[PDB]
């Protein structure tokens, strides 16, 4: 409910500028509009399956505790545990994640918003394609998380079956590969969450600024959001390189184990670790 409201906010903000623009005569700025509410109900159903499969991480993971700790393994089930830990607190800083992003989103359309209604149809134009382009850099990343969430299964399903097939020692190396993916994909939110943050502040700057009358303030203030967005998709674009150059090595590390060779495919998962732990700054 309460983020079900969220959705229905910011679409509601954006179709209303639209509404005012075409009454307005403004069709490039109503066409921006209708694209920006396009690209966030985009958005929102992306989110959603990246919830159903950190469901199934979560699942898989717990699975492999309960049967460590009954079938006698007990350091893999507290490995097990501790990385279930880890994958929830990895899940949690991710909702914090969304949400400030969210109100980036409703701090700009603001912006959009009052600019638009006040006479700045240059500085309205400016803010809702900064909008969209916070937009479509959120489902970029939440497109980047799907495939790092379904490597995460892949190894966790590595681990799991060579529990049950009395490779413990496969199992353990399997489980702490996807441990330090989770740890990694927790070190790369805290670093957006700092980023996030900073925009939020950039953004509250352009609000204030245009309500008082500092135009040039706003515009800067603005500008600065925009380009720190893609700023920042420029290093998620890295990022899937890095992800790219370790999934390839933990394919090597899936048909070694379903060949039944479970020496090369203990080699594969050590050399995505070491390049696992090496991402996000350690």
Do not use: C, F, M, S
Not at 119 to 124: D, I, K, V
Not at 213 to 241: C, D, N, P, V, Y
């Amino acid at each position: 409910a309460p983020e079900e409201e969220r959705i229905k906010y910011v679409i509601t903000v954006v179709e209303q500028i639209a509404k005012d623009a075409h009454r307005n005569g403004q069709e490039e700025l109503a066409k921006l509009a209708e694209r920006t509410a396009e690209e966030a109900k985009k958005a929102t159903e992306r989110g959603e399956e990246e919830t159903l499969r950190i469901v199934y991480v979560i699942v898989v993971v717990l699975q492999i505790a309960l049967e460590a700790h009954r079938n006698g393994q007990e350091e893999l089930a507290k490995l097990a545990l501790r990385t279930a830990e880890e994958a929830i607190k990895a899940t949690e800083r991710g909702e914090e994640e969304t949400l400030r992003i969210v109100y980036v989103i409703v701090v700009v359309l603001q912006i959009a918003l009052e600019a638009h209604r006040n006479g700045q149809e240059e500085l309205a134009k400016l803010a809702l394609r900064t909008a969209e382009e916070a937009i479509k850099a959120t489902e970029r990343g939440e497109e980047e998380t799907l495939r790092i969430v379904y490597v995460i299964v892949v190894v966790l399903q590595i681990a799991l079956e060579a529990h049950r097939n009395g490779q413990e020692e496969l199992a353990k190396l399997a489980l702490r590969t996807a441990e330090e993916a989770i740890k990694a994909t927790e070190r790369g939110e805290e670093e957006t969450l700092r980023i996030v943050y900073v925009i939020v502040v950039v953004l509250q700057i352009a609000l204030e600024a245009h309500r008082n009358g500092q135009e040039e303030l706003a515009k800067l203030a603005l500008r600065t959001a925009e380009e720190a967005i893609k700023a920042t998709e420029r290093g998620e674009e890295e990022t899937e390189r890095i992800v790219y150059d370790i999934v390839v090595v933990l394919q090597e590390a899936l048909e070694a184990h379903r060949n039944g060779e479970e020496e090369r495919a203990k080699k594969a998962l050590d050399e995505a670790r070491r390049r696992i732990e090496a991402t996000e700054r350690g």
